[PDB]
Amino acid sequence: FKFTAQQHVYDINGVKVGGQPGEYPTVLIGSIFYRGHKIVSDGQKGIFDKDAAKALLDQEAELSAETGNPFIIDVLGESVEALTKYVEFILENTTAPFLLDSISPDVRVGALKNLGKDPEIQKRLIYNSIEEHYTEEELAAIKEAGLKTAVILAFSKKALKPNARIDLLQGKDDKEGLIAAAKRAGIEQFLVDPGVLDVASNSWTTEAINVVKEQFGYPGGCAPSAAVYLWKKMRSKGTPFFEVAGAAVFTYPITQGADFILYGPMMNAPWVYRAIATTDAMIAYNNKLTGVKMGTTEHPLLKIF
Amino acid sequence: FKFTAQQHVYDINGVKVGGQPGEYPTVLIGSIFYRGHKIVSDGQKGIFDKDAAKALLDQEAELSAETGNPFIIDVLGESVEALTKYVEFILENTTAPFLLDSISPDVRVGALKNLGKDPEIQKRLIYNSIEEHYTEEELAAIKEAGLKTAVILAFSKKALKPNARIDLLQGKDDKEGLIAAAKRAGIEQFLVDPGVLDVASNSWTTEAINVVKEQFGYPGGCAPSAAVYLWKKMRSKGTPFFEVAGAAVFTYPITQGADFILYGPMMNAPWVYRAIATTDAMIAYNNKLTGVKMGTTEHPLLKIF
């Protein structure tokens, strides 16, 4: 199976994301400083374990080198002060691009004012996310920071059908599309995340990714970790039951041609990389029948066996 | 995914196998008395710990009840004497259908001859397998036993690519093919296993399953356990890395619409069931988008959350 639209392949500070299935390895996006992360003692002041944070980033680099799966760090914060310090640390202690991420839009906006229109911010900071309820002050903050890449959260609790993401992105009736909104903020590269409600609905998320890649060619991915962590019946079972259940959820979108996964807490990277690399390897081996050419020699198929 | 051909759904003594993606849960097939199975004290005579064997069968039934994934037991033997006793034990100690399985055709035929004409055997025993080395003696032994279901195994190093495996199944030039051979033995129900040459080529196995379901509508599955166990680089990493890699390999065919998985030793059932149930749940949630109706309420989607 191949997509009709020519696929966007973005180069975000060296990380290739997008393409036809089997062309590029899955980009894996691990969360750091999330709510309840044990390496954060004060989520308001941003007091965190610098040694432990560095160890997670070094582990991510090592797993990436082993499998060929590139990484983007999901940097979460509950306050402007905290998220600013987290981003300053991430900039210094890895080369990877990263999501500027918060539940609260004003935390993302405040952090951007602090980080400013730094050329490094423009190259490495991906805004997470341009969502249905975006504000003009949010677009102003993105434009003033000169960001070029954003996650487009193409989710609406009233665009549940995959096909309805066309309306969300392009606009409909009197409603500006999320792509138009992003472009007004000066965004040039769009990572489309159709959103995940629960584990089962990951199949609708993946169909939405397929619609977006088929018709627009934007890189498609999703964030199933919250749904997996709300699955107490599985998580309480411990090893290896939680990990293989998680593996089934995180690999599923990749089996249908998705480009990136937000796999949740970085502490899970060791098993997530091994599962995702396995799926990537099997998909790319199908290239030998389809004629799709791998865009890089740094691919699980050439590395994990 | 929805498959072109009208799908064959077989009722093998109460186990539903086949159909469109999300119609029926994955049938899981665990191996017992395999080479080096430590509950066997004498593999030539078929002497084994019956309590340990029963404990495995009870565990399978408990896991099946939990997820709604039906089970068929893969009964392996290295001698006629041993495989005959194993089949006798399985008939009395579970209600499940089972594969009569040996790497040696002489062992399968010998064991089958010992079982004679038995309606319970005819309902529950699946011949594993009709493969490239089949003989008229073997087809005659199957017909004499009155078997109605067989695994059709297209594992051949003369048939690497999916279309070559289809040629082995459907026939080509001077060869009737494995399905035609099975029909001459009186087989009316075909569990098509294209074989797994290695881990990466599980995508080729899955493409062969797709062509089978697309064109013939026969249930399709595979046995990737041997390939995964021979993956030294991943196996060397231990738990849970080996299990999540295994889960990625075993779930991949299911994500592409496969009907059954031989997951290897039954001792791995606890994590295999959890991984496969997860995939099944996501696929069945897709049913509205595919135009499919669940054929049973005994489905992971309605059980595991």
Residue numbers in the entry:
A (entry chain A), B (entry chain B): 2 to 306
Sentences from the paper on this structure:
Apart from snapshots of individual reaction steps of MtgA, structure‐based mutagenesis combined with enzymatic activity assays allowed a mechanistic description of the methyl transfer between Cbl‐CH3 and THF.
During energy production in Desulfitobacterium hafniense, MtgA catalyzes the methyl transfer from methylcobalamin (Cbl‐CH3) to THF in the catabolism of glycine betaine (GB). The topology of each subunit is characterized by a funnel of eight parallel β‐sheets connected by α‐helices on the outside that form a complex of two perpendicularly oriented TIM barrels.
